[PDB]
Design a protein around this ligand. Structure first.
Ligand code: HEM
Ligand code: HEM
Ligand code: CL
Ligand code: CL
Ligand code: NA
Ligand code: NA
Lengths: 713, 713
């Protein structure tokens, strides 16, 4: 069947905005996962998981009689797709159970892991999501094997279709670098927003870079990829060495014996894949990665034997039974148990990437400290495993259940508790009038609130106006935020806040974070009044102000908008057309196509553009909330042509006279070009649409202001 | 960006069931188009359209100073994509404004037509849809040029994204037959469900079949395609000759002058395409099809000149200025006006396909009758234009406004008015008890009601249980309907109906159509009782019974289910995998993926399979409404393999003993393979899901019973 994508493969794709509709969701409109989870008997779940660890199924026999290592891997791959660039990936939506991740080569035989958990999923039903269950199982694995975890939070609601994520442009699984769709350029520079070295890998190639078995070079790829998943050197060493304290790899015979991944398998395989023709195809004969390494002398028990082995032997390059590069201990005794035959033992073995932890000089210093102080190792691992498995959960208000760690961690972008009465509706009205009487303009107020709120991304639930981090480094200096204009607005609002708070009794006060948002509300109300329409914009107080010391500046860098079509802003020059970057931003903001359309058309006419650019400002009443963007865009009296100076800037002239009327960017003009978007623009540009336009704009503005308000969820 | 479709291009596609979500629709969830239309000043709209006919715009100057031919073409192409096989295409969703149809070669320059209507659309806003506006404009064009139409109904609600229609498998526009993705096989047999001879054509090639200018063979393709659009010979001749009474074709220079279609054009084209480098690119220099034919001596006025020309001259093969095959009148004087220069006249000209109406023997007889009796031609054309433009609108109850023709037409599948009191709740309880006391089983009642209601398709809104057409030819003899079992059920229901109706006074009576549906409801209630549960199935009376004389047997044949996965039925052997056919059926029934999932699982256990097949009957309590299908499908204790006899039948055996537990088809097992479907099946197979499953089943059951109930809308 030939499709639109076939005929016009470079046309913009809006389907990403309308994933996750109520059509594909089996649960009722009113289902609230948090409410279900809060009544789960978590202790009972964990007893069932504990029992499962040593209850072998014959269709995928447990190595050493214990499924712990399989489950740790499973949970670490669930989390391990996370990228800091865009927040996409991670364990927080249970996406491992869908395409493509269910069929990535690095996820081979996790289909068996997940199938082992169906009976518990079945028993507890909607009260425990697959997303939560994956991570809970990894924690119970660890605990059953003698490792004390840092804690666990529930609250990852399940999803019902695949997310549309850019995982790379290669058309071959595992393609080595330097092909026609290489993700690498320059001196081994991995393209943003990717966080893995080859298509279908979680981080790095366990043989070494593009299969070259050099631990030093492999260390470069480990450091770079892990950094792109928000882990520093200490955390990376703790996680790799921690994980590889347990279980084993699987490479008992050649990889040609392994058949189709789950999405390609026959209907009779019932959602499993990688069926192997090698001997029994499972257990002692299993093939997963093609490597055949067992790291420790007690693969089912926490120990400090990984570093004992790493540092206690010299290593020789060797090949698994599938032909993969791996390493074996020179001169060693057979001290490693076999997974199924109590009469066999094996020499210690390592991956290239395990040896990275000894031969990269910065890793070696950490690894040695951990070898000499295993208690430090265990604490670092526990902390890093919690961060790994929670990194995309969002604010601590979303954390559910009885095992949530009390310690507040800097990476959580923490928000202090509120310990005073909040402002009421009359206070809000008072403050809106004070803001408008200060002489701050509609443009300043809208722009500032937009800048504060629109750092939110739904991918990892970071960002948003809560915190008032706009006032701090680094947000206060980001170019998009217009640092000198911002500072003047903030000074004025801070004086309003001080005077209101100084007048109160009873401990009532308003945070700056709330006042930034409220003042933006006032701007939108005043713009509506400038158009002749009285509207009240909703406002919910309860934001708190975070300190600089509670804000990790280097982690906040990935939230900087380098492209924000809603402010007609592009920080530099990109390969991806600006309209594609608009739809990417709308997806991160959780906006539908209608929402994105109304929001953009209103911001244009409110003066929200960076630098006060005229591009897309298709109105002669700037700072009035009207549908003029749409009416003027759609006027066939105007003809549009790209400028000679810049192909991405367009001039709109009167068709009859030649007179210059407007200028616009690709982001403005796409609403008059794309057939779906133009259809939306036509609703808002019709003569009956002024009330609708205003109502819909106010609704979407309030939605954006509240994106991070999980305290009200 | 590589996508799931790239990696697994043959995996089943569920996106078609979550098109048209509330996410992509700009109108609020409570918007009701009918109510907006009913308040439209239709007379005002028509005055504005009359004005527009001769208001020429310089960016696309009007031929003869009158846009009427362009608009007729526009409205005939809007309607013209309709196929009877599936009901898809047609004017009823306004789909000409989206991809791919906005860019089909045969819709070249209708982008200009649509743009000329934006000011009207804008002025009247949501009270007239684009869908309605395209048809109304065609009507006003005809009236403006002196042809009185048969009527007009509003009520086509606009849509907001493209429909996923199979238009063919070719990967080249306009590809001639016999290629790697040929729509033709054998003796010029066009593949179902297609209704056009080439990718991107509305029906036929105007030069002749695969470009061969033979009118006799062109007539074969005209007959076949038009029959696939629900039009017989008289209708066909009336429409082609009526259309071609007006306007002209456009081929002033070589087609290489014509640039990108709208979906390929640059952003500055603002949604238009086919920009031409030939001379001024428009007006006298226009290039659309490449043909240069003007049919009559008065192209802007209704006339009897089409058949006077066709019969009055002999025709000579020639070429247009673009090189296309067309025909010129031998020895004729230059009597045809030029569209732009009062000093030029032209000889009469004809397409190959126009000559088909004279050189095909059966068309010749009609054409001569029309020539000799122009009043017969005008009435046939009026009636056929009404049919053409309303064929996908569904029951007359959906027809809005003051110009709806009073005359009931056979093609509308008419249902008599109800002229008596309806059954009340106490009567419904009394009838349900009578049905359950008669001996009819759960399986029979469910099966019968399913058969009756599931003929509905949302594509053209034909079918459904209203009418009780299940009792008439041809539905009563369809194999999927189990004619012998059906007859026995109907006899019993007819005897209940007679006895109830004979006991009433006041004129109260129950239709058989209602009783079939009510009896189905009683089966579902009894099945819940068999499972130990109280359940209430909603029922809405008010269906009437249609007669055999109101039921066109040949038109009804397209509704026959040759695949119905919901009954595990496949009439024969198809190229398309049966699970694809299930999703296609779910789309015509307007079901989401969760709905399709719950529905099928319940039908399986209630005994709705054709022939009492045990395939997918995964329960030991058949005729009890339980979630057993899901719980047993998902049991990892069972291993599945295709049978040696039949690769599309699977056997499910106990993993430990090898013993046979179940058998299933692809339709059954896809719910345990497809990673999205299996996620849905897990929700209904969970331990906490029995009540959910019953509630969800009853809701979807009632949805299906009411699909055609536009008298309640
Ligand atoms: C440089 C980073 C990493 C590399 C290249 C890597 C590589 C791999 C490979 C190739 C396997 C064998 C797959 C199979 O054949 O069954 C595996 C197994 C495993 N890895 Fe890692 N890994 C890394 C990091 C991690 C981390 C961060 C954790 C968790 C903290 C983890 C925990 C495990 C566990 C527990 C197993 C054993 C699975 C079993 O017993 O079935 N790994 N590793
Ligand atoms: C065998 C079926 C038909 C064929 C092959 C056919 C072919 C075409 C072609 C090739 C054009 C020229 C397009 C261009 O270059 O601008 C056209 C024009 C047109 N057709 Fe048809 N046609 C068919 C049936 C119809 C029907 C059923 C109607 C309406 C009832 C219709 C009404 C028109 C009118 C009004 C125009 C003139 C457009 C203008 O003045 O701009 N045709 N036809
Ligand atoms: Cl994601
Ligand atoms: Cl359609
Ligand atoms: Na994420
Ligand atoms: Na249709």
């Amino acid at each position: 069947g030939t499709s639109n994508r076939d005929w016009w493969p470079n046309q913009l794709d809006l389907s990403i905005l309308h994933r996750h509709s109520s059509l594909s969701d089996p649960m009722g409109k009113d289902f609230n996962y948090a409410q279900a989870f809060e009544k789960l008997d978590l202790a009972a779940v964990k007893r069932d998981l504990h029992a499962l660890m040593t209850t072998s199924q014959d269709w995928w026999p447990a190595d050493f009689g214990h499924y712990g290592g399989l489950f740790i891997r499973m949970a670490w791959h669930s989390a391990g797709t996370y990228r800091t660039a865009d927040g996409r990936g991670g364990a927080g939506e249970g996406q491992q159970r869908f395409a493509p991740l269910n069929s990535w080569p690095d996820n081979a035989n996790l289909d068996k892991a997940r199938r082992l958990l169906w009976p518990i999923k079945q028993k507890y039903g909607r009260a425990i999501s697959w997303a939560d269950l994956l991570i809970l199982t990894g924690n119970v694995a660890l605990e059953s094997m003698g490792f004390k975890t840092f804690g666990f939070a529930g609250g990852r609601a399940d999803t019902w279709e695949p997310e549309d994520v850019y995982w790379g442009s290669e058309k071959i699984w595992l393609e080595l670098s330097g092909g026609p769709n290489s993700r690498y350029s320059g001196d081994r520079q991995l393209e943003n927003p990717l966080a893995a070295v080859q298509m279908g890998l979680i981080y790095v190639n366990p043989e070494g870079p593009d299969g070259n078995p050099d631990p030093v070079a492999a260390a470069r790829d480990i450091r770079d990829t892990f950094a792109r998943m928000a882990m520093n050197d200490e955390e990376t060493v703790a996680l790799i060495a921690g994980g590889h304290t347990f279980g084993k790899t699987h490479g008992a015979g050649p990889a040609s014996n392994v058949g189709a991944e789950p999405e390609a398998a026959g209907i009779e395989a019932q959602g499993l894949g990688w069926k192997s023709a090698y001997r029994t195809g499972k257990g002692a004969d299993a093939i997963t990665s093609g490597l055949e390494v067992t790291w420790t002398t007690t693969p089912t028990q926490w120990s400090h034997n990984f570093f004992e082995n790493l540092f206690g032997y010299e290593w020789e390059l060797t090949k698994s039974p599938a032909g993969a590069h791996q390493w074996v201990a020179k001169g060693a005794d057979a001290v490693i148990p076999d997974a199924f035959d109590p009469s066999k033992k094996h020499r210690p073995t390592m991956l290239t990437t395990d040896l990275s932890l000894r031969f990269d000089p910065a890793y070696e210093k950490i690894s040695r400290r951990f070898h000499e102080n295993p208690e430090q190792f265990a604490d670092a691992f526990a902390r890093a495993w919690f961060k790994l498995t929670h990194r995309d959960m969002g604010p601590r208000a979303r954390y559910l259940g009885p095992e949530v760690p009390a310690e507040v961690l800097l990476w959580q972008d923490p928000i202090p508790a509120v310990d005073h009465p909040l402002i009421d509706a009359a206070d809000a009205a008072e403050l809106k009038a004070k803001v408008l009487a200060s002489g701050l303009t509609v443009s300043q107020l809208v722009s500032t609130a937009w800048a504060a709120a629109s750092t939110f991304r739904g991918s990892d639930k970071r960002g948003g106006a809560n915190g008032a981090r706009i006032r701090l480094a680094p947000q206060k200096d980001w170019e998009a935020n217009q640092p000198e204009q911002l500072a003047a607005v903030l000074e004025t609002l801070e004086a309003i806040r001080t005077a209101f708070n100084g007048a109160q009794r009873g401990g009532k006060q308003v945070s700056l974070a709330d006042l930034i948002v409220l003042a933006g509300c006032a701007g939108v109300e005043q713009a509506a009044k400038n158009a002749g329409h009285a509207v009240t914009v909703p406002f919910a107080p309860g934001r708190a102000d975070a300190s600089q010391e509670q804000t990790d500046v280097e982690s906040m860098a990935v939230l900087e908008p380098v492209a924000d079509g809603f402010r007609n802003y592009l920080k530099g020059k990109y390969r991806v057309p600006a309209e594609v970057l608009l739809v990417d931003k709308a997806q991160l903001l959780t906006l539908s196509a209608p929402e994105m359309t109304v929001l953009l058309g209103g911001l244009r006419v409110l003066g929200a553009n960076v630098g006060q650019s005229r591009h897309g400002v298709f109105t002669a009443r700037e700072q009035a909330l009207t549908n003029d963007f749409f009416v003027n865009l759609l006027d066939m009296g105007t003809e549009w042509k790209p400028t000679a100076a810049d192909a991405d800037v367009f001039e709109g002239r009167d068709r009859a006279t030649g007179e210059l009327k407007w200028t616009g960017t690709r982001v403005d003009l796409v609403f008059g070009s794309h057939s779906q978007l133009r259809a939306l623009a036509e609703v808002y540009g019709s003569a009956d649409a002024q009330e609708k336009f205003v109502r819909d704009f106010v609704a979407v503005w309030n939605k954006v202001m509240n994106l991070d308000r999980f305290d009200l969820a």
